[PDB]
Design an enzyme around this catalytic site. Sequence first.
Site, PDB file in Angstrom:
ATOM      1  N   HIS A  65     -73.194   3.943 -37.373  1.00  0.00           N
ATOM      2  CA  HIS A  65     -71.830   3.715 -36.905  1.00  0.00           C
ATOM      3  C   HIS A  65     -70.812   3.740 -38.043  1.00  0.00           C
ATOM      4  O   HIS A  65     -71.128   3.536 -39.213  1.00  0.00           O
ATOM      5  CB  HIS A  65     -71.693   2.430 -36.087  1.00  0.00           C
ATOM      6  CG  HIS A  65     -71.739   1.172 -36.898  1.00  0.00           C
ATOM      7  ND1 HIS A  65     -72.908   0.487 -37.143  1.00  0.00           N
ATOM      8  CD2 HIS A  65     -70.756   0.460 -37.496  1.00  0.00           C
ATOM      9  CE1 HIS A  65     -72.647  -0.587 -37.868  1.00  0.00           C
ATOM     10  NE2 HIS A  65     -71.348  -0.629 -38.093  1.00  0.00           N
ATOM     11  N   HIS A  67     -68.516   2.239 -39.797  1.00  0.00           N
ATOM     12  CA  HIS A  67     -67.978   1.179 -40.637  1.00  0.00           C
ATOM     13  C   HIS A  67     -68.224   1.516 -42.098  1.00  0.00           C
ATOM     14  O   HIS A  67     -69.135   2.269 -42.433  1.00  0.00           O
ATOM     15  CB  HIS A  67     -68.589  -0.180 -40.289  1.00  0.00           C
ATOM     16  CG  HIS A  67     -67.932  -0.831 -39.118  1.00  0.00           C
ATOM     17  ND1 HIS A  67     -68.539  -1.818 -38.374  1.00  0.00           N
ATOM     18  CD2 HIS A  67     -66.704  -0.647 -38.577  1.00  0.00           C
ATOM     19  CE1 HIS A  67     -67.714  -2.203 -37.413  1.00  0.00           C
ATOM     20  NE2 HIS A  67     -66.589  -1.520 -37.526  1.00  0.00           N
ATOM     21  N   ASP A  69     -69.603   0.209 -44.569  1.00  0.00           N
ATOM     22  CA  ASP A  69     -70.867  -0.039 -45.245  1.00  0.00           C
ATOM     23  C   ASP A  69     -71.985   0.902 -44.815  1.00  0.00           C
ATOM     24  O   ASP A  69     -73.088   0.791 -45.350  1.00  0.00           O
ATOM     25  CB  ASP A  69     -71.284  -1.505 -45.132  1.00  0.00           C
ATOM     26  CG  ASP A  69     -71.327  -2.020 -43.710  1.00  0.00           C
ATOM     27  OD1 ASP A  69     -70.552  -1.552 -42.851  1.00  0.00           O
ATOM     28  OD2 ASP A  69     -72.132  -2.945 -43.463  1.00  0.00           O
ATOM     29  N   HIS A  70     -71.721   1.831 -43.892  1.00  0.00           N
ATOM     30  CA  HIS A  70     -72.694   2.850 -43.495  1.00  0.00           C
ATOM     31  C   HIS A  70     -72.134   4.248 -43.633  1.00  0.00           C
ATOM     32  O   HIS A  70     -72.871   5.178 -43.966  1.00  0.00           O
ATOM     33  CB  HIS A  70     -73.119   2.626 -42.036  1.00  0.00           C
ATOM     34  CG  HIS A  70     -73.573   1.227 -41.769  1.00  0.00           C
ATOM     35  ND1 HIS A  70     -74.684   0.682 -42.378  1.00  0.00           N
ATOM     36  CD2 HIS A  70     -73.030   0.238 -41.022  1.00  0.00           C
ATOM     37  CE1 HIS A  70     -74.832  -0.568 -41.976  1.00  0.00           C
ATOM     38  NE2 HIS A  70     -73.840  -0.862 -41.154  1.00  0.00           N
ATOM     39  N   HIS A 141     -71.614  -2.772 -30.660  1.00  0.00           N
ATOM     40  CA  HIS A 141     -71.039  -3.087 -31.961  1.00  0.00           C
ATOM     41  C   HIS A 141     -69.829  -2.196 -32.239  1.00  0.00           C
ATOM     42  O   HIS A 141     -68.825  -2.646 -32.809  1.00  0.00           O
ATOM     43  CB  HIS A 141     -72.104  -2.898 -33.036  1.00  0.00           C
ATOM     44  CG  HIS A 141     -71.595  -3.172 -34.408  1.00  0.00           C
ATOM     45  ND1 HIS A 141     -71.346  -4.448 -34.866  1.00  0.00           N
ATOM     46  CD2 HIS A 141     -71.238  -2.332 -35.407  1.00  0.00           C
ATOM     47  CE1 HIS A 141     -70.889  -4.381 -36.104  1.00  0.00           C
ATOM     48  NE2 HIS A 141     -70.819  -3.107 -36.456  1.00  0.00           N
ATOM     49  N   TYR A 169     -65.837 -10.827 -32.327  1.00  0.00           N
ATOM     50  CA  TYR A 169     -65.299  -9.958 -31.292  1.00  0.00           C
ATOM     51  C   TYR A 169     -64.863 -10.775 -30.086  1.00  0.00           C
ATOM     52  O   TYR A 169     -65.658 -11.563 -29.560  1.00  0.00           O
ATOM     53  CB  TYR A 169     -66.364  -9.001 -30.787  1.00  0.00           C
ATOM     54  CG  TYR A 169     -66.752  -7.876 -31.715  1.00  0.00           C
ATOM     55  CD1 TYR A 169     -66.261  -7.786 -33.003  1.00  0.00           C
ATOM     56  CD2 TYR A 169     -67.610  -6.889 -31.272  1.00  0.00           C
ATOM     57  CE1 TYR A 169     -66.628  -6.741 -33.841  1.00  0.00           C
ATOM     58  CE2 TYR A 169     -67.996  -5.838 -32.104  1.00  0.00           C
ATOM     59  CZ  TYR A 169     -67.496  -5.768 -33.379  1.00  0.00           C
ATOM     60  OH  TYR A 169     -67.868  -4.714 -34.172  1.00  0.00           O
ATOM     61  N   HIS A 203     -79.377  -2.489 -41.926  1.00  0.00           N
ATOM     62  CA  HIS A 203     -79.267  -3.554 -42.911  1.00  0.00           C
ATOM     63  C   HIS A 203     -80.673  -4.069 -43.176  1.00  0.00           C
ATOM     64  O   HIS A 203     -81.437  -4.293 -42.232  1.00  0.00           O
ATOM     65  CB  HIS A 203     -78.386  -4.699 -42.401  1.00  0.00           C
ATOM     66  CG  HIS A 203     -76.950  -4.600 -42.828  1.00  0.00           C
ATOM     67  ND1 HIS A 203     -76.514  -5.021 -44.064  1.00  0.00           N
ATOM     68  CD2 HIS A 203     -75.855  -4.126 -42.186  1.00  0.00           C
ATOM     69  CE1 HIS A 203     -75.212  -4.819 -44.163  1.00  0.00           C
ATOM     70  NE2 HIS A 203     -74.789  -4.271 -43.039  1.00  0.00           N
TER      71      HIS A 203
END
Length: 252
Positions: A65, A67, A69-70, A141, A169, A203
Amino acid sequence: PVQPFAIWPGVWYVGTENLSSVLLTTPQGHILIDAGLDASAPQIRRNIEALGFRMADIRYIANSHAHLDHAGGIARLKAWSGARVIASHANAEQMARGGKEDFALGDALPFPPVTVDMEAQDGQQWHLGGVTLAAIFTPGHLPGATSWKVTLADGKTLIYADSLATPGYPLINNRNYPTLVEDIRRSFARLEAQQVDIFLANHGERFGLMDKMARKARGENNAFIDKAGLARYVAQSRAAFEKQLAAQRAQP
Ligand SMILES: [Zn+2]
Ligand SMILES: [Zn+2]
């Protein structure tokens, strides 16, 4: 830094302690799943090179996804490899915007924009060098969150699970992502039903990376064989999600 290492024949960990990046190697070239932060990209390249593989041989970069950090490192790793980037439509749109207009974050955590070359639809398959990569749509997510199923050339099944987290959220009357509750509950069911030999996630703490890596390095060849791990990750995620929804219902 965490040194790169073999998870299984043809499957290599090239990420950091916290941020996964997984390299699937084949005679026809490689697939990289996720790419950490933009600041992670030099380290991921070093890790791939320290294993003796060439960036130039990476044919595809798949995103879980969009974000930072990916997907943050994808722009750089794409430039260095010439790979085609594969992602769901919603992730491709968010990557084109550098992470901005996020339904929950707005513009708080941007990253380098990247062009996705190939969109992924649910169940779609790509074949490379005896390996099959397939998209598993697992929204919640983010609207486009995607898990990846890999059938390795030896017949083992690997699942690379996306995040099922919903940090901060609003779940009730979310005007930016109205269907998130229905989506995430379906994602739990989709993942827990998967047949899986090797459970990975985006993660390390979601799949027990550090403990399994240590065992593997000390001769436990099957350390990453974890047939119930994905179901357990879903169960932990579901329990927290359902508590979250109940807490928000109690005081909306
Ligand atoms: Zn995320
Ligand atoms: Zn993450």
